[PDB]
Amino acid sequence: SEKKTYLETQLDAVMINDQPYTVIFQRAKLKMQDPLELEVLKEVDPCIVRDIDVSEDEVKVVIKPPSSFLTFAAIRKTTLLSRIRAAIHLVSKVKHHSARRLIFIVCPENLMFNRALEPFFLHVGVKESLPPDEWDDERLLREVKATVLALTEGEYRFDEYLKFHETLKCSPIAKELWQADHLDAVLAVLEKWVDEEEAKERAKVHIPK
Ligand SMILES: [Cl-]
Ligand code: NA
């Protein structure tokens, strides 16, 4: 019937709407003490508006990106070269922790893109308050690898790359990406890839010869 998505499962929350994005958490299940801890969510990024309602039993976040932002599946339709550049910007955005209590969960359902293929997150956690509510660099690294493979290689869904990559049809650069030790080595693998792919696209505007 209705399976919960990776986001839903990791947040233990319900996506009740996608127009506009709306996430519903049970207050009883949160580490949140003072609802004021969630005010930081008003200050994630100037493009995407987030309205927060802390009621006696639930916390509701309503997330409204600009109407001209592109979904993950829209970027998946662009050129390989373009998708790898997008993936580089993603890895560059999450490479570090926030100093302002914000914690990032990376998956295709949680991302939208601006006109310059800059990624933005929809839902963001708050340390010790709202899931994801703790750092876990390993979890973030795996999500990023799966999300980047889903965007670039794109021969499987995010969940399948995430969950199952040791059992599926691994490609050479993909293999390099899973292999990578940390986000910087993910970024190095991508950089050699975008160079390779840029040389290929350029060859298409010269006629040898
Ligand atoms: Cl050229
Ligand atoms: Na750590």
Numbering used by the authors: 2 to 210
What's the paper's own text on this?
The membrane-bound EssB is an integral and essential component of the bacterial type VII secretion system that can contribute to pathogenicity. One of these is EssB, a 50-kDa bitopic integral membrane protein that is conserved among T7SS gene clusters in Firmicutes. The architecture of Geobacillus thermodenitrificans EssB has been investigated by combining crystallographic and EPR spectroscopic methods. The protein forms a dimer that straddles the cytoplasmic membrane.
